[PDB]
Amino acid sequence: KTIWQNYIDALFETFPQLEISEVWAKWDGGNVGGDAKLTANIRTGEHFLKAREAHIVDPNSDIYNTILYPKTGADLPCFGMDLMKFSDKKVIIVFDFQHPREKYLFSVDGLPEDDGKYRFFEMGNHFSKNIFVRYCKPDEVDQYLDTFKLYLTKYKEMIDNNKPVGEDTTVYSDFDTYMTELDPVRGYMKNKFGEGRSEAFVNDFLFSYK
Numbered sequence: 001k002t003i004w005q006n007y008i009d010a011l012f013e014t015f016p017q018l019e020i021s022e023v024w025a026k027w028d029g030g031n032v033g034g035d036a037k038l039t040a041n042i043r044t045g046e047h048f049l050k051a052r053e054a055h056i057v058d059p060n061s062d063i064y065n066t067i068l069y070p071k072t073g074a075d076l077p078c079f080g081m082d083l084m085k086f087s088d089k090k091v092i093i094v095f096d097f098q099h100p101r102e103k104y105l106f107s108v109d110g111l112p113e114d115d116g117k118y119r120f121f122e123m124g125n126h127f128s129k130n131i132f133v134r135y136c137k138p139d140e141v142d143q144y145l146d147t148f149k150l151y152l153t154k155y156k157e158m159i160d161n162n163k164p165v166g167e168d169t170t171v172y173s174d175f176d177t178y179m180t181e182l183d184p185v186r187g188y189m190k191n192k193f194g195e196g197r198s199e200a201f202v203n204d205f206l207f208s209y210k
């Protein structure tokens with residue numbers, strides 16, 4: 001199992017409509033069975049274009065990367081999460097409302113802020129004033145679970161109060177173009193699963209509305 005199960009459960013507790021509509025990849029790779037496992041899922045449901053759910057695990061790594069893309073028409077942000085356990089004393093937890101409009105600073109008043117000193121992501125470009133990043137230990141991940149449920153409640157609120165119905169995937173063009181520029185997914189998958197698979201995972205699954 002995953003250290004992440006309590007995040008994963010809270011996610012689909014808040015959004016019970018997100019049913020798997022395509023299992024994009026179940027892949028084995030890494031060291032030889034294969035010791036690296038990818039589950040790539042796409043989920044649909046009321047008020048969403050998609051939720052794309054990547055989950056990679058090997059003996060050392062445990063990575064859950066999931067973006068909720070809502071239907072367009074209501075200027076709504078995505079909700080993105082990168083739950084990354086690299087070693088057994090190194091985890092990084094990332095979650096934010098990620099707005100499709102470039103250069104623009106989105107926020108939700110009441111929520112942790114941020115500043116925003118965090119190095120790998122740029123506040124105000126597809127990351128909000130309330131971007132949540134922490135570094136911690138595997139055994140202490142659930143300390144931030146309630147904060148997580150607070151972001152989910154707020155995001156649920158804004159979906160429910162706007163109820164978008166548009167399907168204009170080009171709204172997310174700039175966003176997914178930007179996110180494809182992030183490292184290291186491309187190379188991590190390259191090594192672990194091969195070039196064809198890394199290319200497809202990134203361009204056809206993770207960030208496919210470029």
Ligand SMILES: C=CC1=C(C)/C(=C/c2[nH]c(/C=C3N=C(/C=C4\NC(=O)C(C)=C4C=C)C(C)=C\3CCC(=O)O)c(CCC(=O)O)c2C)NC1=O
Nearest residue numbers: 054056063065082084092120179182183184185186188189
């Ligand atoms: C989805 C698959 C996925 C994989 C396979 C992955 C692997 C991964 N991400 C890392 C760091 C990191 N990865 C990210 C973020 C990302 N990096 C990305 O490739 C993407 C798409 C994001 C975010 C949406 C960040 C912010 C770090 C910083 C680590 C640090 O604190 O130094 C590292 C440590 C080594 C390094 O920084 O080069 C690995 C192995 N991260 C992932 O999200």
